[PDB]
Amino acid sequence: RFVDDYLPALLAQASQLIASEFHEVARQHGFSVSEWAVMASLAGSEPISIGQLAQVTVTKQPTVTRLLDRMEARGQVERLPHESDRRITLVRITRKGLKAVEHLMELAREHERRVLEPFGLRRAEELKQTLRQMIDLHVH
Amino acid sequence: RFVDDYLPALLAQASQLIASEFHEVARQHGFSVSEWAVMASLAGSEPISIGQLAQVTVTKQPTVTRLLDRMEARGQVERLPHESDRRITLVRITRKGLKAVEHLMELAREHERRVLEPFGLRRAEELKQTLRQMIDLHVH
């Protein structure tokens, strides 16, 4: 059976199943999936470009721009000029956004800990290191 | 930075980046992403339910049903009654579909081998085993 060990299918199924579990929690706390992805991606971060945010949230750039229009209207994020290049808009989470998502982030950590507990610390760390290395090799 | 080591974000980014690389090849061979996902998921498989196909292709069931309507019209797949329960439709790839996707599947194997080569056989096998175990623990 081709798909049983095919890496892209394994990554896609694992990603969807784990993410869907936490998205239920996010929505019961009043967050859309994309709002949660943006705020979690910006929390504890220096300002990053719209393109970087689109990559780390796995969201198309025009979609991200529309999302930021409304999240900025609500005071949860702020767009800023890049200090040097003007073709570049940076974005950051505001204090309002951070306080809004703080509790959800703790719940997200608890859920991740539950997901990784059966694998043990060594296998969990190996998985995260491999995923990080793969991202850094394949990002454009 | 919360998102740098957050498992769902790592899985989602790795999945998207690797998949996007191969989707380019699929489209240059005349396949849509969803057509490729269905045919690759059915290749070498016994007939599976529409729900199982939706899970393994990470596609909503109504979307899968519409896709199968047109792929069955083109003779690439076939829907069948389940032998016992009638609330269940099974689906299989036809010989026409298998021959259509054979070369693409070889290219997919070559691409996966390229993606996994820098990690070595041990780390690649560890990744695939962990992903498989996670899927089997979280599928419903």
Numbering used by the authors:
A (entry chain A), B (entry chain A): 10 to 149
Give the exact sentences the study uses for this entry.
We characterize the binding of IAA to MarR-family regulators from both iac and iad loci. Most characterized MarR-family regulators function as repressors by binding to an operator sequence upstream of the genes they control. When a relevant ligand binds the MarR repressor, it releases from DNA, allowing gene expression. The structures of MarRs from representatives of each auxin degradation operon type establish that each has distinct IAA-binding pockets.
The MarR_73 residues coordinating the indole ring of IAA are Tyr-15, Ala-18, Trp-45, Arg-46 and Val-65, while those coordinating the IAA carboxylate are Ser-28, His-32 and Arg-46. Individual mutations to the carboxyl group-coordinating residues weakened or eliminated IAA binding. The 1.5 Å resolution crystal structure of the MarR_73 S28A R46A double mutant showed no ligand in the binding pocket while maintaining the same structure as wild-type MarR_73, with a root-mean-square deviation in Cα positions of 0.18 Å. Using MarR_73 S28A protein with reduced ligand binding capacity, we identified a 24 bp double-stranded DNA oligo carrying a sequence located between MarR_73 (iadR) and gene 72 (iadA) that was capable of binding to this variant MarR_73 protein. These results show that MarR_73 is capable of binding to a DNA regulatory site ahead of the primary iad operon and appears to use auxin ligand binding to trigger DNA release and operon derepression.
